[PDB]
Design a protein around this ligand. Structure first.
Ligand code: 8CA
Length: 131
């Protein structure tokens, strides 16, 4: 996947706080993460895709091969098992930890990068446009 390549800035966000809460993020991390307006920088080198989110809150980075599970430390310090695939042009990122699971879909829509975060009954949607 490469249509995802480029530098992206968060422009809008709905229900993210509820999302973080449901995932289990403590209030302190919720406050500073909810107010963050991170840049998402996505690059690809062959089979390795790298995605960085930079913000004053925290900088994070993952690098992976489609279909290969990998260990991740999240901005909220969860140690999760992550598995990202490309499905109908949508990057589907799954995190599993403690028998729980959350799903993050990244898609390209017009000129937006759209992010859908799902946990249990909560769905948060985030939009990012080119910088
Ligand atoms: O829009 C995001 O960057 C984002 C997308 C999906 C899930 C998450 C979580 C967070 N962000 C935002 C974020 C992450 C790293 C750096 C800045 C902002 C998500 C914060 C920690 C809990 C889970």
């Amino acid at each position: 996947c490469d249509a995802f390549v480029g530098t992206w800035k968060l422009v809008s966000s709905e229900n993210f706080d509820d999302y973080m809460k449901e995932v289990g993020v403590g209030f302190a991390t919720r406050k500073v993460a909810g107010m963050a307006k991170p840049n998402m920088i996505i690059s690809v080198n062959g089979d390795v895709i790298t995605i960085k989110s930079e913000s004053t809150f925290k900088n994070t980075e993952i690098s992976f091969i489609l279909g290969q599970e990998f260990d991740e430390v999240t901005a909220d310090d969860r140690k999760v098992k992550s598995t990202i695939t490309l499905d109908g042009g949508v990057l589907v990122h799954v995190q599993k930890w403690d028998g729980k699971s959350t799903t993050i879909k990244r898609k390209r829509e017009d000129d937006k990068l759209v992010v859908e975060c799902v946990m249990k009954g909560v769905t948060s949607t985030r939009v990012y446009e080119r910088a």
